[PDB]
Amino acid sequence: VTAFVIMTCIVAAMGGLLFGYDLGISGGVTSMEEFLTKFFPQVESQMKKAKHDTAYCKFDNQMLQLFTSSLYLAALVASFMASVITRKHGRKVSMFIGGLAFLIGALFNAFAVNVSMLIIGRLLLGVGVGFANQSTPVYLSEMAPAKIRGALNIGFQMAITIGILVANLINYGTSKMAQHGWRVSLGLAAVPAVVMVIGSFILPDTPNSMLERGKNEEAKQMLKKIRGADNVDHEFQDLIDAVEAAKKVENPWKNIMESKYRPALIFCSAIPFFQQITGINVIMFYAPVLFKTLGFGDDAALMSAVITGVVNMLSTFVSIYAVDRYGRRLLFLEGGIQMFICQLLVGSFIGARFGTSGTGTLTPATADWILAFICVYVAGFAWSWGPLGWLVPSEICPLEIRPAGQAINVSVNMFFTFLIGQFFLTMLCHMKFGLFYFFASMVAIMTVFIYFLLPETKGVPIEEMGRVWKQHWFWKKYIPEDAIIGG
Numbered sequence: 001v002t003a004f005v006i007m008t009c010i011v012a013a014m015g016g017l018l019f020g021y022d023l024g025i026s027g028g029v030t031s032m033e034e035f036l037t038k039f040f041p042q043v044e045s046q047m048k049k050a051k052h053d054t055a056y057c058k059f060d061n062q063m064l065q066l067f068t069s070s071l072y073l074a075a076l077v078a079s080f081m082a083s084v085i086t087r088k089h090g091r092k093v094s095m096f097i098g099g100l101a102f103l104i105g106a107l108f109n110a111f112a113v114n115v116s117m118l119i120i121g122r123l124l125l126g127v128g129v130g131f132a133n134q135s136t137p138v139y140l141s142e143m144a145p146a147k148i149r150g151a152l153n154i155g156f157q158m159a160i161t162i163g164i165l166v167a168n169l170i171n172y173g174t175s176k177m178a179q180h181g182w183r184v185s186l187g188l189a190a191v192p193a194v195v196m197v198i199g200s201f202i203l204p205d206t207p208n209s210m211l212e213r214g215k216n217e218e219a220k221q222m223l224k225k226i227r228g229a230d231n232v233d234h235e236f237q238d239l240i241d242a243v244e245a246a247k248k249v250e251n252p253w254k255n256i257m258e259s260k261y262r263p264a265l266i267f268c269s270a271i272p273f274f275q276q277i278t279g280i281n282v283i284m285f286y287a288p289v290l291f292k293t294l295g296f297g298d299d300a301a302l303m304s305a306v307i308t309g310v311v312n313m314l315s316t317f318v319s320i321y322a323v324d325r326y327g328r329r330l331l332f333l334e335g336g337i338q339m340f341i342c343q344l345l346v347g348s349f350i351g352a353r354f355g356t357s358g359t360g361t362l363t364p365a366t367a368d369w370i371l372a373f374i375c376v377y378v379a380g381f382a383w384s385w386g387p388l389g390w391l392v393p394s395e396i397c398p399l400e401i402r403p404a405g406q407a408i409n410v411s412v413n414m415f416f417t418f419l420i421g422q423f424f425l426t427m428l429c430h431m432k433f434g435l436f437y438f439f440a441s442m443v444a445i446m447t448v449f450i451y452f453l454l455p456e457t458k459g460v461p462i463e464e465m466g467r468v469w470k471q472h473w474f475w476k477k478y479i480p481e482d483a484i485i486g487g
């Protein structure tokens with residue numbers, strides 16, 4: 001562990017600011033009537049004097065769903081392109097492309113004069129997220145010393161939560177400008193993108209990719225630099241062994257179906273689906289919608305998003321502290337149990353407060369308790385399925401399929417992020433609290449899935465992770481001894 005590798009990983013992790021900024025900025029921008037008037041006049045007409053309505057609830061027709069979907073579709077496709085570039089040219093090159101596409105997208109948005117420019121900008125944001133999310137977790141998990149890989153990789157998730165929070169605060173400010181507030185909100189996304197582009201110039205690439213691409217002496221000297229030791233022979237032998245196997249595989253997409261990759265393939269596919277079917281991106285807007293329906297105004301709705309965003313960010317530190325000391329499993333298990341219980345409590349609390357009230361409207365105190373329970377659910381996600389959904393796929397793949405497995409992770413993640421968010425929009429917007437019971441049942445399923453099927457990965461050198469699958473009661477049948485590195 002050196003100061004150079006920690007600074008390297010902090011700078012690289014700032015690639016998560018891009019996706020997080022976009023996740024946090026969009027809600028507040030859609031509620032700005034100047035934005036609606038310019039680009040979505042059919043929505044503006046529905047929102048005029050609709051004191052108890054929320055503008056993104058109106059994005060439920062085919063054309064508006066197409067606009068919303070375009071970011072996730074571009075990200076899903078760009079993720080697959082990033083797998084090829086990340087392997088052939090390096091993790092840094094994909095991080096550069098991600099920052100640059102996001103930067104150009106932010107400018108098209110901020111200076112949009114018609115919806116055509118908004119569509120181009122949104123597609124470019126999606127390209128940026130696809131490249132940034134595909135490549136940055138690979139970068140962190142290869143660069144980090146094995147002992148603290150969890151903590152350093154989760155810097156990426158921390159950056160996501162920082163972007164969400166910062167973006168909500170920016171919308172708080174730009175909502176007060178006399179004019180053009182939405183241009184400032186969408187244009188400030190360029191700031192972390194410029195940081196990411198310049199970072200991609202100055203960062204080194206990973207020794208793992210340098211060696212796979214034939215830069216033998218550069219890779220060894222780089223490993224010595226990030227580990228701060230003249231003798232890296234044991235860990236460099238891991239890289240040599242990983243590249244010897246990896247050089248045999250010209251097309252990872254045509255080999256990822258082989259038995260020896262099956263545990264990795266299952267988890268790279270299942271973890272992103274499970275991460276979204278927690279309901280996180282639905283539940284995170286339940287209280288904002290509730291406060292608006294109760295008459296508390298746009299500012300109270302945004303304030304609950306800021307509160308939720310602070311909890312979301314600060315709770316990430318629990319995973320940073322515990323992930324390498326106590327393990328990924330403990331975090332999955334506690335986080336799933338805590339999320340499950342909070343979903344049961346909020347669902348039954350809302351259901352009960354209508355059968356005991358008498359007046360038909362929830363009180364402010366009741367709304368605050370609903371936000372409180374939701375915040376404990378968000379805290380549980382924020383130290384489990386949030387950070388681990390960007391850590392675990394990046395640390396379980398052999399080198400030759402590591403960019404491809406992380407591309408599966410991103411692309412499945414984008415697909416279900418949109419699908420689940422759109423599918424539940426009407427239930428969210430009509431305050432159908434039964435959704436908490438559905439997501440509770442999914443969280444039960446994924447927690448049992450983890451309990452029986454996820455071997456503990458903490459502290460294992462990334463190229464030696466086959467050792468962990470080989471000792472798992474179920475996955476051991478897929479892993480041949482000859483493929484295992486180290487031991």
Ligand SMILES: CCCCCCCC/C=C\CCCCCCCC(=O)OC[C@H](O)CO
Nearest residue numbers: 039040041063066067070073074077078119
């Ligand atoms: C690798 C690069 C990316 C590859 C993948 C590309 C995905 C393209 C998908 C959709 C874009 C089209 C979105 C069209 C949105 C139309 C919105 C609209 O009509 O808004 C006007 C409104 O209805 C009244 O004012």
Ligand SMILES: CCCCCCCC/C=C\CCCCCCCC(=O)OC[C@H](O)CO
Nearest residue numbers: 103104105107108109111112113114116117
């Ligand atoms: C490699 C590409 C590098 C691109 C780098 C990002 C810059 C592009 C962003 C915004 C447009 C800036 C021009 C400002 C004027 C906008 C008005 C405009 O172009 O209007 C035409 C439009 O078709 C209405 O009909």
Ligand SMILES: CCCCCCCC/C=C\CCCCCCCC(=O)OC[C@H](O)CO
Nearest residue numbers: 110111180183184186187188190191194195
């Ligand atoms: C290392 C850090 C480098 C940081 C580099 C950051 C560059 C982008 C910054 C801001 C863009 C967002 C603000 C754009 C707002 C435009 C709105 C506008 O034009 O309003 C006036 C109106 O047009 C009159 O007619």
Ligand SMILES: CCCCCCCC/C=C\CCCCCCCC(=O)OC[C@H](O)CO
Nearest residue numbers: 347348351352437438440441442444445448
């Ligand atoms: C192997 C994994 C199997 C997992 C299996 C799922 C476990 C239970 C999950 C969610 C609760 C399901 C619904 C519970 C509530 C049903 C009754 C209900 O909704 O009652 C309405 C009433 O008004 C009160 O709000």
Ligand SMILES: OC[C@H]1O[C@@H](O)[C@H](O)[C@@H](O)[C@@H]1O
Nearest residue numbers: 023160161281312386387389
């Ligand atoms: O912090 C919340 C965010 O956590 C990330 O790990 C997820 O991929 C996002 O969908 C989510 O909005």
